[PDB]
């Protein structure tokens, strides 16, 4: 965390991307490199309770060096405002691109596959994302898919063992991915119309959700493989990259450029 170099001199904000975790995020320019950056600015006095959360997410992402995790560039503290500088991803989130209209399975598989490479890099480094969902998967202008907005230590994407506050491992991410697959194919997670507290007991109590509708069987089997109530019966991210649904449908990441151009 740099406190001597003035972030307002190092960076040129250009537009507000939107609100984010605990602060506003800007599309910006590193003035030394003139590369585009994402800049979250947090007033630490206005969010004193969540500061360990902020610290934890900075710590976990500063330890990631993978094409599939949003790159971390540093932090700056000017008076009470913390600037968190990250890679900028100009294609938006996976959830943004579900809004132009329902995704076909080629796009679902290609995004799923890229997410899985992120999960497998993380899980091999003994890390957990803890909040895998469409809104936390960001895409570049050229179709690359990267994980962002890590959780630290809404329930719709949570594994049943996570809800029941048991010690959870990488298999929680696998469950969340199975929910994300349903989201990318349907637009929203299971139980999305229900009050969160109801969903909090539905997930431990009920059978795993399955992908309903007119989809190919491998997509349904990909989902149900992820959505196993027992975490130790969920495949690794490495296993799932060989799932028949991924092998038959996933394309090159550049194929998504068309879908990204639809959103703009």
Instruction: Select the residue interacting with ligand SQB from 11, 76, 88, 156 (CB under 6 A).
Output: 88
Minimum separation from the CB atom of position 56 to ligand SQB (A): 8
Span interacting with ligand SQB, options 107-115, 133-141, 177-185, 235-243, rule CB under 6 A:
133-141
137 labelled as ligand-binding?
Answer: no
Instruction: Select the residue interacting with ligand SQB from 2, 12, 17, 220 (CB under 6 A).
Output: 17
Q: Is 131 in the active site?
A: yes
One of 96, 131, 173, 261 is an active-site residue; which one?
Answer: 131
Toward ligand SQB, which CB reaches closer, 184 or 246?
A: 184
Toward ligand SQB, which CB reaches closer, 151 or 190?
A: 151
Toward ligand SQB, which CB reaches closer, 1 or 210?
A: 1
Strand bridging mode 36-43 / 72-78: unpaired
18 binds ligand SQB (CB under 6 A): yes
Cβ neighbors of 83 (< 8 A, separation 6 or more) are 7, 11, 39, 40, 41, 75, 76, 77
SS (H, E, C) 95-140: HHHCCCCCCCHHHHHHHHHHHHHHHHHHHHCCCCCCCCCHHHEEEC
DSSP 81: E
Instruction: Select the residue interacting with ligand SQB from 98, 116, 138, 211 (CB under 6 A).
Output: 138
For residues 30 and 38, the answer to whether their CB atoms sit within 8 Å is no
Measured distance CA(211)–CA(214) in Å, rounded: 9
Helix H or strand E encompassing 245: helix 244-249
Q: Which residues bind ligand SQB (CB under 6 A)?
A: 17-18, 20-22, 25, 38, 40, 54, 57-58, 61, 70, 72, 84, 86, 88-89, 92-93, 135-136, 138, 148-149
């Amino acid at each position: 965390t740099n406190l001597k170099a003035d972030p307002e001199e190092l960076f040129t904000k250009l537009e507000k991307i939107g609100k984010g975790s605990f602060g506003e995020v800007f599309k910006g320019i590193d003035n030394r490199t003139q590369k585009v950056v994402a800049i979250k600015i947090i007033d630490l006095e206005e969010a004193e309770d969540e500061i360990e959360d902020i610290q934890q997410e900075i710590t976990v992402l500063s330890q990631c060096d993978s094409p599939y995790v949003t790159k971390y560039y540093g932090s700056y503290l000017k008076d009470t405002k913390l600037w968190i500088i990250m890679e900028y991803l100009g294609g938006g989130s996976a959830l943004d691109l579900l809004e132009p209209g329902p995704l076909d399975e080629t796009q679902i598989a290609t995004i799923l596959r890229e997410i899985l490479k992120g999960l497998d890099y993380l899980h091999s480094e003994k890390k957990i994302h803890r909040d895998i969902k469409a809104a936390n998967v960001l895409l570049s202008e050229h179709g690359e898919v990267k994980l962002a907005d890590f959780g630290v230590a809404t329930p719709f994407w949570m594994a049943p063992e996570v809800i029941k506050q048991s010690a959870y491992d990488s298999k929680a991410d696998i469950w969340s991915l199975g929910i994300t697959a349903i989201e990318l194919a349907r637009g929203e997670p299971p139980h999305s119309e229900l009050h969160p507290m109801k969903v909090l007991f539905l997930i431990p109590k009920n059978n795993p959700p399955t992908l309903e509708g007119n989809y190919s069987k491998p997509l349904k089997e990909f989902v149900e493989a992820c959505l196993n109530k027992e975490p130790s019966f969920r495949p690794t991210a490495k296993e799932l990259l060989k799932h028949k649904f991924i092998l038959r449908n996933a394309k090159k990441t550049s194929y998504l450029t068309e879908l990204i151009d639809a959103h703009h």
